[model samples]
Target: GSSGSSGVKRAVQKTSDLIVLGLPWKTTEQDLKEYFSTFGEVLMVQVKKDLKTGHSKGFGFVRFTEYETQVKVMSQRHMIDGRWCDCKLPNSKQSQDSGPSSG
Candidate 1:
């Protein structure tokens, strides 16, 4: 015999963040954090640094604590450090410059 246990569920939801392309080589993780803060709170920020001289790889990823915050910033292309950068779904479109295509 087992006690009745129904309609009790714990479902936590945490969606994936966005990826930033065309980041300036000089841009740092801190830069991404400070710039996106204008929209809302930033959960995490990371810049892809080159193996040499710690130069930025012109790409990175950013996360937010709230879903609304992600929407506000993802609405359109963002201008970071005087350069227009594209922020899009990482899984949606993973292959871009890294993939070889001449067409």
Candidate 2:
């Protein structure tokens, strides 16, 4: 008898927390919270920094609890400081099972 195979499909869970960091506007966490609060609930606002300097890493992460809020913020992002601030998502490939394996 020949072995038969079946395709597998899965429902992926997309985390609602969106990362909004990299602000060119020399702004602070307070400013970010205040500005973004107009849209919806902000879970956390973090401005990345150098491990030693402790200075604003010229970027920040504003996490929203809802996907709607994330979309709203992402739709209207601007290039006020110098460049466009981006809302980057965490890489999901890290959680995948072994496939082809990296050489």
Candidate 3:
């Protein structure tokens, strides 16, 4: 949430593959997109499913338009047909820790 630490010139926006779980097998791409769309623009929605018998995988992944939106959506809990769900932050991909580096 604190981007000021790296406030030099280029904002250098970023996007993360936030993970989501607790969705049903019937969860369609449209459904997921619509759901998350309430919070942010759903750029990507990948709901894993079994090849046979029509069963969803352990979970799925989603992408948001903005990092602020992503973080905001990550804070809220998802729901379906009167059931409960959860949005989580998986292990974010990273290389060198910290914000800047010397060349």
**Using Cα atoms with residue i matched to residue i, what is each candidate's TM-score against the true structure?**
0.68, 0.56, 0.65
Give the per-residue lDDT of model 3 (tens digit) for 1-103: 7555655444444677877778776777778899888886898898777788667874788998888888777787767755566777665352323457665
lDDT of 3: 0.74
Model 2 scores worst on lDDT over the 10 consecutive residues at 89-98
Q: What is the lDDT of residue 43 in candidate 2?
A: 72
lDDT top scorer: 1
Instruction: Provide the lDDT at 75 for model 3.
Output: 80
List the global CA lDDT of all models: 0.77, 0.65, 0.74
Q: Which pairs clash (backbone N, Cα, C closer than 3 Å) in model 2?
A: 21-60, 24-81
lDDT of 1: 0.77
Q: Which stretches of candidate 3 lie over 4 Å from their true place?
A: 1-13, 92-103
Model 1 segments more than 4 A misplaced = 1-14, 52-54, 92-103
C-alpha RMSD of each candidate structure in angstroms: 12.5, 10.1, 10.0
Q: Candidate 1 lDDT, tens digit per residue, 1-103?
A: 8789877653565556688888887678887788888788789898877787767788888898888778666777877778879876676346535567686
Off by over 4 Å in 2: 1-11, 51-54, 79-83, 92-103
